[PDB]
Amino acid sequence: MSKELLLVVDAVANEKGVPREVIFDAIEAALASAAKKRYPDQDVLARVTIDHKDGTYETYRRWIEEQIENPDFGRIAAQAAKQVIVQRVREAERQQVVDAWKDRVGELITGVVKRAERGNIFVDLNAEAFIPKDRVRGYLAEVRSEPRGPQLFISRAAPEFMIEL
Amino acid sequence: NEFTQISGYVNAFGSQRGSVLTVKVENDEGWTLVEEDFDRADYGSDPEFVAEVSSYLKRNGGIKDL
Amino acid sequence: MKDLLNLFNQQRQTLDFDAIKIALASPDLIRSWSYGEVKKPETINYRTFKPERDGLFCAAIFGPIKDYECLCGKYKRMKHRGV
Amino acid sequence: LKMVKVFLAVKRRIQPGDKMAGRHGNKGVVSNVVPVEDMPYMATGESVDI
Amino acid sequence: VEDCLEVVNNRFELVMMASKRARQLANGVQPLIDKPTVMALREIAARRIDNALIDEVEKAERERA
Amino acid sequence: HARSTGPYSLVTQQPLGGKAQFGGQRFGEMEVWALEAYGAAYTLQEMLTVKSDDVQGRNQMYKNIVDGEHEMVAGMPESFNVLVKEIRSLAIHMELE
Amino acid sequence: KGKQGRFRQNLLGKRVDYSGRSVITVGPYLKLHQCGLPKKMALELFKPFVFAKLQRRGLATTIKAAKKLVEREEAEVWDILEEVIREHPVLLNRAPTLHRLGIQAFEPVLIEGKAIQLHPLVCTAFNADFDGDQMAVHVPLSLEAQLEARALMMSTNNILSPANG
Amino acid sequence: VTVNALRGGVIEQIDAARIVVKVNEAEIAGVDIYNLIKYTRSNQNTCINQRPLVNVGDVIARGDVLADGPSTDIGELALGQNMLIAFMPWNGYNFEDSILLSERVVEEDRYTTIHIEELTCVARDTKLGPEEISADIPNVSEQALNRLDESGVVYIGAEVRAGDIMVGKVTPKGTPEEKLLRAIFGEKASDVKDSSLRVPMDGTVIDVQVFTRDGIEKDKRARQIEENEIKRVKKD
Amino acid sequence: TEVEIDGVLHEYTTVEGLQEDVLDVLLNLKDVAIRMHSGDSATLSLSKQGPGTVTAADIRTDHNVEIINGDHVICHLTKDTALNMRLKIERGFGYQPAAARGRLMLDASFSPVRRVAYAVEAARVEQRTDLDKLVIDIETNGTIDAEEAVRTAADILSDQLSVFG
Amino acid sequence: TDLDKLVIDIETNGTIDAEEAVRTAADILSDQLSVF
Amino acid sequence: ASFQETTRVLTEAAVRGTRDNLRGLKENVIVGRLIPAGTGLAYHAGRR
RNA sequence: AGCGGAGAGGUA
DNA sequence: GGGTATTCGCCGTGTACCTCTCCTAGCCC
Ligand SMILES: [Mg+2]
């Protein structure tokens, strides 16, 4: 089963901003967590080496290596691998939005509005931005909110937008 | 999959997908403060699940009942 | 079957009245009571767990089996109401 | 497709509140369990059970 | 409970007054003198709290809300 | 055996019976006669409407118990609506004026 | 119509929760206003008040951990159950209720047994023996119901008979 | 409930489970053998037992008993025990047909009775998928899974408690992360429901009976108990 | 307290070669009494094969563990089956059940005294008044002597009366 | 759970304290048990 | 129509078209309101 | 997976 | 038209609890 996963990782849902390297690291970390949950002595890290665009599934165990590992069915290991996979997908999407915010350009951003709360609004630029007042094309750049993914902050009225125009 | 307000609290949102209720508490600026998942088979009763959701909404930032 | 968002809201019925009146029922009033007409004496079809249309257990006359769901499955969302 | 029957053997002791009848129709319910030192004793030292 | 039946003649009026005082004490307020109902009955039997004072406290809590 | 909250029937919104399936004790008619002999309006109202029959009433009472506030809102029993729907099936109009 | 109809089985007499039954023994050490109650029976009956007190004390953040701490049966749940049952009356009822005094209110205590201990001056008005007799208990949970049970249902207040003086 | 010797003779071969007699030339070609029931449930969830009373090498006649049955002495009927009685009021504990018991009637196990319960786990066939008896159950801690074997059921002679999982049974209830988890595993990753047999009454497990249908592959524990039954019938 | 037999899995099975059941062997092991000089725990093993009765003197004891001669039999062996049985002795007082403490469990009654009687008689002695004497007949199982029993009884009384003052 | 609590009521005439009377009674019983 | 001959009282109330004013004790149990005896007399006094 | 109609036995 | 005299039905006959089994199965291939 090498190409059956290759037809799954090749989806463009999460591989459009950052390629399939971090998804492969998430799969290797989930299988290492499954092998650590299968083994009674879980104190070292396991390396699941998968090559680029071929999908050779092999499990190792380094303590520098000590012995080989073996997989199983693992329904509790499947649940643990599922939660590590969605946590690493959330971490990779947070990394994608913060590097698309911090490496493309720090300047005026152009987007359309999606939501509007009481005294606030959300501007969509697959990243979400806050509309501070203390579609729109305001010029504001700041970095904050390190938990729950870092998001860019723009404004609806700023002196930098009047200076750039 | 859209978070629908339960019409019992002014600051509450709920999402049910396969007998698992996802309840989140949003800030007035729009950011989600907390988010937890509540199952149904683990409680085995209706008003205990109501009491659990009500206590999670009251302890984690329930400003009013509108 | 299972619904948790509609279950939280309460105080929907006031249940405040003074008296109880009992009388006869005209056939036009019985026709205004109901929502549909039954024609076939079939409740549940064999070899499948689905209600029979225009029977004693029907979805077009009384209501759907599952909550926020149709018999075919074209509408599977809580946002669709009155359709 | 498959049936698994498990036999569970429980050995229960005597508890205060259990119904216990005699031989001539004098039914009763156990009130409490009293230690041997509080039971009335005869001249030889034999303690009465009931 | 004999003093509570001494300070008022009717029993159901005593029950309703103690229920109103226990509802006022359960939300959190300083008593006149450990359970809220027992403290309400003790405040009734000591001739400290009246129905007019209960209505005044309820009106003050309704105005403060 | 004892219970706090278990399963409920679907024909009428009432708890089940028996030691199996967590059944509740049947509050008989003579006990209701004794509580009416006591007076006891608020005790009898919270016994056959809030605890047993009403769907939203037992949830509201349970969350008011676990929250600490005291706000009891009673309602009509669902078995009365079952009796109304059963009388209306006999071509007899019964309206709640 | 009839006894098994929808009028006599579901409207006049209804099945209620927060209730249970057990056999009765005799307790000479009790008082007139108090009675006995088993530990697991009172833990099953006073479960919502135990859950509310465990949420107020801070021993469990959610009701799932509080329920697991109740089923774990440590000493803190016994402390909570002893603090809850102190000033809370329960309604003891005989299974035939032809008497006016078939329902009486008592302040229960926690005993180490499986039966409901009763004062010997109570079973005369109940017309109850002690050979296979069962009594169904009920707990009032509202404040008005608790005050009505304390005022006009207590065993110390019901001394005289309703038939004669 | 008791067995009786049809023909008298020598009881030189005796066991707790079987009694072998040897008839004489006057009563007789083969000798008689009596199999005793040890531990099986009755219709009222009680335990019946047949314990032998004869010895090795003693002559008998036609009609003598060989094993005392349940609630049965050596030939008399026995319902209860014998204990001291005093007819006197004792501090109100024997007030109105109440019974007072001492510590000596409890500490010697005079009224200890054995009750055998029947707990079954039925695995039906559903439209979404058949339910398995696999031991890998999600959302179940290891403290309730140590007594389970590789078959998914509990061992014979294991001290269980109230709420313990004796037979592990799962049923299938039917985002790109779920597709990735389903492709990473062999179509057994998620979408399962936990519904296993639990104890409602703590005791030991004395016998595990497994019933299977034709066309279904037998489990290794079912094969092991089949080898045990064929070895037992070959031995006897 | 506990009995560990290799062939006996649980306390309801039947072992080949034994006339009685396992519960009869457990009650006969509960019937005997063991006097130990020093130590709070011990382990005794017995080995008896072939036909014949099994008494309490057939076990293997230590130098400090003293066993009564044991006219009461434990079990009855018929066939040529070896009986390897391991026992365990512990110290305690009162009555401890098997619940509150291939491995078996047995109840234990830590009481070497069977019955105690006494009577008060008058002694004609030239004194200021009528001085009375008393006799106490102690019936034990041979484990404890009548001197150290009343010695530790007076020790228990002096330790219980030490709270005053 | 199975523990006994002892409550003794002493009504002395006033020539000695009640706690002193309990202490002398315990001392007398301790001497009578220590002689034997 | 509570204890005997439910059909006769039901057809009499259906023909005559009676109106139940709920001035009793058992009908307040059937409907679900407070009992007009004891602590529930003040609620019936404040209602009307 | 929860919602039930008969028949039989037993206790107060 | 109008009083007794039978006479065919109508309608009812204690409460609460605990165990167990068995449920429409029949037929021409
Ligand atoms: Mg009786």
What is the rounded distance in angstroms from the CA atom of residue C82 to the CA atom of residue C72? 17
Which residue shows structure tokens 């008393």?
I134
Pair of tokens at residue H193: 């429901």
Radius of gyration of chain F measured on its C-alpha atoms: 15
What is the rounded distance in angstroms from the CA atom of residue G32 to the CA atom of residue G104? 11
Pair of tokens at residue H108: 């010697």
Contact G103 F35 (CB under 8 A): yes
Q: Could you give the C-alpha distances from J36 to E34, I136, J29, J31, J33, in angstroms and in order?
A: 52, 13, 11, 9, 6
Asked whether I105 and I96 are in contact (CB, 8 A), the reply is no
Q: In this structure, are A100 and A113 located in the same domain?
A: no
Q: How far is the CA of C46 from the C1' of M23 (A)?
A: 20
Q: What is the separation, in whole angstroms, between the first and last Cα of chain A? A: 57
What is the rounded distance in angstroms from the CA atom of residue I60 to the CA atom of residue I50? 17
Pair of tokens at residue I91: 């110290």
What is the rounded distance in angstroms from the CA atom of residue G127 to the CA atom of residue I133? 52
Residue F18, CB, strand M, below 7 Å: yes
Contact F59 B50 (CB under 8 A): yes
Asked whether I48 and I58 are in contact (CB, 8 A), the reply is yes
Contact F62 B58 (CB under 8 A): no
Q: What is the maximal distance between C-alpha atoms in chain G?
A: 56
**How many other C-beta atoms are found inside a 10 Å radius of the C-beta of residue G85?**
22
H156 touches chain I (CB under 8 A): yes
- CA D31 / ligand 1 centre spacing (Å): 15
Q: How far is F66 from chain G (nearest CA, A)?
A: 5
Helix (H) and strand (E) counts in chain J? 1, 0
- Which helix (H) or strand (E) covers residue C81, if one does? none
H52 touches chain I (CB under 8 A): yes
**How many other C-beta atoms are found inside a 10 Å radius of the C-beta of residue H231?**
10
Q: Give the amino acid at H47.
A: C
Q: What DSSP character marks residue H200?
A: -
Asked whether H40 and H28 are in contact (CB, 8 A), the reply is no
Q: What DSSP character marks residue H159?
A: B
Q: Give the CATH number for residue E34.
A: 3.90.940.10
Which residue in C15, J12, E53, J28 sits closest to F80, CA to CA?
C15
Distance of CA I77 to the CA centre of its chain: 24
A3 touches chain H (CB under 8 A): no
What is the rounded distance in angstroms from the CA atom of residue H64 to the CA atom of residue H61? 6
Mutate to test the interface with E, among G33, G147, G158 (most CBs of E within 10 A): G147
Helix (H) and strand (E) counts in chain A? 4, 8
DSSP D2-50: EEEEEEEEEEE---TT-B---SSS---EEEEE--GGGS-B-SS-PBP--
Q: Could you give the C-alpha distances from F78 to C54, F12, G14, H192, in angstroms and in order?
A: 28, 7, 12, 36
Distance of CA F70 to the CA centre of its chain: 19
Which residue shows structure tokens 């902050």?
A153
Asked whether K25 and K36 are in contact (CB, 8 A), the reply is yes
Q: In this structure, are A73 and A112 located in the same domain?
A: no
Which residue shows structure tokens 């057809």?
K11
Q: How far is F24 from chain E (nearest CA, A)?
A: 28
Going by their DSSP bridges, the two strands H197-198 and I41-48 should be labelled as unpaired
Q: Is G119 exposed, middle or buried (0-12, 13-18, 19+ CB in 10 A)?
A: buried
State yes or no: chains E and G have 3 or more CB pairs below 8 A: yes
Distance of CA A4 to the CA centre of its chain: 23
Which residue in G50, G103, G53 sits closest to G73, CA to CA?
G50
What is the rounded distance in angstroms from the CA atom of residue H53 to the CA atom of residue H62? 16
- Chain K from 1 to 48: CB within 8 A of any C CB: 13-15, 17-22, 31-32
Asked whether H93 and G28 are in contact (CB, 8 A), the reply is yes
Query: Going edge to edge, which strands form the sheet with F92-96?
Result: F92-96, C20-24, K19-20
What is the rounded distance in angstroms from the CA atom of residue A158 to the CA atom of residue A140? 7
State how many domains chain A has: 2
What is the rounded distance in angstroms from the CA atom of residue D3 to the CA atom of residue H225? 15
Pair of tokens at residue C66: 């599952």
The residue range of the domain holding A37 is 1-104
What is the rounded distance in angstroms from the CA atom of residue E32 to the CA atom of residue E10? 23
- Name the β-bridge partners of I5: I85
Which residue in F48, F34, F46, F36 sits closest to F79, CA to CA?
F48
Residues 6+ apart with CB under 8 A from I126: none
**Chains G & K: contacts with CB separation below 8 Å:** 13
Asked whether G14 and F14 are in contact (CB, 8 A), the reply is yes
- CA K22 / ligand 1 centre spacing (Å): 41
Q: Is H236 exposed, middle or buried (0-12, 13-18, 19+ CB in 10 A)?
A: exposed
Asked whether G93 and G136 are in contact (CB, 8 A), the reply is yes
Contact F73 C17 (CB under 8 A): no
What is the rounded distance in angstroms from the CA atom of residue I135 to the CA atom of residue F27? 63
Q: What is the separation, in whole angstroms, between the first and last Cα of chain J? A: 34
Q: Provide, for chain K, the percentages of residues in helix, strand and coil under a 3-state DSSP scheme, each rounded to the nearest 5.
A: 50, 5, 45
The residue range of the domain holding E57 is 1-65
**Chains B & F: contacts with CB separation below 8 Å:** 23
- Please state how this structure was obtained: cryo-EM
CA atoms within 13 Å, Cβ hemisphere of C36: 14
Q: List chain M nucleotides near protein: any atom < 7 Å from a Cβ.
A: 11-20
- Which helix (H) or strand (E) covers residue I4, if one does? strand I3-5
Asked whether G21 and F1 are in contact (CB, 8 A), the reply is yes
Q: Give the amino acid at G25.
A: T
- Specify the fold of I1-110: RNA Polymerase Alpha Subunit; Chain A, domain 2 (2.170.120)
Which residue in H47, H37, H49, H45 sits closest to H117, CA to CA?
H45
Which own/partner contact pairs does D34-37 have at CB distance under 8 Å and 24+ positions apart?
Answer: D34/H93, D34/H100, D34/H101, D34/H102, D34/H103, D35/H102, D35/H103, D36/H102, D36/H103, D36/H104
E strands present in I1-48: 3-5, 34-36, 41-48
Known binding positions of C for Zn(2+): 70, 72
CATH number of B1-66: 3.30.160.560
E strands present in A15-147: 48-49, 58-62, 65-68, 112-117, 120-124, 128-130, 143-144
Residue G5, CB, strand M, below 7 Å: no
| Sign of the torsion formed by the C-alpha atoms of A147, A152, A158 and A163 | positive
Asked whether F54 and F75 are in contact (CB, 8 A), the reply is yes
- Which helix (H) or strand (E) covers residue E13, if one does? helix E11-26
Which residue in A106, A111, A107 sits closest to A126, CA to CA?
A111
- Which helix (H) or strand (E) covers residue A117, if one does? strand A112-117
Distance of CA H148 to the CA centre of its chain: 17
State how many domains chain E has: 1
Instruction: Report CA dihedral (I146, I148, I153, I157) to the nearest 10 degrees.
Output: 140
What is the rounded distance in angstroms from the CA atom of residue G18 to the CA atom of residue G141? 9
What is the rounded distance in angstroms from the CA atom of residue B28 to the CA atom of residue B18? 29
Residues 6+ apart with CB under 8 A from K1: K9, K10, K13
| Sign of the torsion formed by the C-alpha atoms of E46, E48, E49 and E50 | positive
Asked whether H54 and H71 are in contact (CB, 8 A), the reply is no
Contact H111 D13 (CB under 8 A): yes
Q: Is I159 exposed, middle or buried (0-12, 13-18, 19+ CB in 10 A)?
A: exposed
